[PDB]
Amino acid sequence: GYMLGSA
Amino acid sequence: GYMLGSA
Amino acid sequence: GYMLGSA
Amino acid sequence: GYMLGSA
Amino acid sequence: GYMLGSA
Amino acid sequence: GYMLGSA
Amino acid sequence: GYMLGSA
Amino acid sequence: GYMLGSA
């Protein structure tokens, strides 16, 4: 599984 | 922001 | 499954 | 924002 | 699936 | 804005 | 801005 | 899967 993103 | 998670 | 989007 | 989730 | 757009 | 989502 | 996510 | 865009 994975989690990605911008903040 | 933008996010994507999957599992 | 997945969840994605903008905030 | 925009969102899409699926499972 | 997908989500796209402008904001 | 403009949006399109599909699943 | 513009965004596209898919999974 | 992927997420892309501008901010």
mmCIF file of C-alpha atoms in Angstrom:
data_model
loop_
_atom_site.group_PDB
_atom_site.id
_atom_site.type_symbol
_atom_site.label_atom_id
_atom_site.label_comp_id
_atom_site.label_asym_id
_atom_site.label_seq_id
_atom_site.Cartn_x
_atom_site.Cartn_y
_atom_site.Cartn_z
ATOM 1 C CA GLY A 1 0.000 0.000 0.000
ATOM 2 C CA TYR A 2 1.072 3.626 -0.258
ATOM 3 C CA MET A 3 0.296 7.188 0.726
ATOM 4 C CA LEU A 4 1.520 10.233 -1.159
ATOM 5 C CA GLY A 5 0.767 13.886 -1.410
ATOM 6 C CA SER A 6 1.583 17.534 -0.899
ATOM 7 C CA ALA A 7 1.328 19.771 2.159
ATOM 8 C CA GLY B 1 -2.663 19.955 -0.697
ATOM 9 C CA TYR B 2 -3.253 16.886 -2.878
ATOM 10 C CA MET B 3 -3.338 13.318 -1.561
ATOM 11 C CA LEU B 4 -3.684 9.721 -2.721
ATOM 12 C CA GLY B 5 -3.584 6.639 -0.524
ATOM 13 C CA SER B 6 -4.269 3.029 -1.432
ATOM 14 C CA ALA B 7 -4.073 -0.364 0.247
ATOM 15 C CA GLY C 1 -9.202 0.490 -2.169
ATOM 16 C CA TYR C 2 -8.130 4.116 -2.427
ATOM 17 C CA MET C 3 -8.906 7.679 -1.443
ATOM 18 C CA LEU C 4 -7.682 10.723 -3.328
ATOM 19 C CA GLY C 5 -8.435 14.376 -3.579
ATOM 20 C CA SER C 6 -7.619 18.025 -3.068
ATOM 21 C CA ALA C 7 -7.874 20.261 -0.011
ATOM 22 C CA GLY D 1 -11.865 20.445 -2.867
ATOM 23 C CA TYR D 2 -12.455 17.377 -5.048
ATOM 24 C CA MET D 3 -12.540 13.808 -3.731
ATOM 25 C CA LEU D 4 -12.886 10.212 -4.891
ATOM 26 C CA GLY D 5 -12.786 7.129 -2.694
ATOM 27 C CA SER D 6 -13.471 3.520 -3.601
ATOM 28 C CA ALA D 7 -13.275 0.126 -1.923
ATOM 29 C CA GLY E 1 -11.061 5.506 -11.134
ATOM 30 C CA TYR E 2 -9.989 9.132 -11.392
ATOM 31 C CA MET E 3 -10.764 12.695 -10.407
ATOM 32 C CA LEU E 4 -9.540 15.739 -12.293
ATOM 33 C CA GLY E 5 -10.294 19.392 -12.544
ATOM 34 C CA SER E 6 -9.478 23.040 -12.033
ATOM 35 C CA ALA E 7 -9.733 25.277 -8.975
ATOM 36 C CA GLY F 1 -13.723 25.461 -11.831
ATOM 37 C CA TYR F 2 -14.314 22.392 -14.012
ATOM 38 C CA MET F 3 -14.399 18.824 -12.695
ATOM 39 C CA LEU F 4 -14.744 15.227 -13.855
ATOM 40 C CA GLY F 5 -14.644 12.145 -11.658
ATOM 41 C CA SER F 6 -15.330 8.535 -12.566
ATOM 42 C CA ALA F 7 -15.134 5.142 -10.887
ATOM 43 C CA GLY G 1 -4.521 24.970 -9.662
ATOM 44 C CA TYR G 2 -5.112 21.902 -11.843
ATOM 45 C CA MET G 3 -5.197 18.333 -10.526
ATOM 46 C CA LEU G 4 -5.542 14.737 -11.686
ATOM 47 C CA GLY G 5 -5.442 11.655 -9.489
ATOM 48 C CA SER G 6 -6.128 8.045 -10.396
ATOM 49 C CA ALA G 7 -5.932 4.651 -8.717
ATOM 50 C CA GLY H 1 -1.859 5.016 -8.964
ATOM 51 C CA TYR H 2 -0.787 8.642 -9.222
ATOM 52 C CA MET H 3 -1.562 12.204 -8.238
ATOM 53 C CA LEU H 4 -0.338 15.249 -10.123
ATOM 54 C CA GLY H 5 -1.092 18.901 -10.374
ATOM 55 C CA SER H 6 -0.276 22.550 -9.863
ATOM 56 C CA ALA H 7 -0.531 24.786 -6.806
#
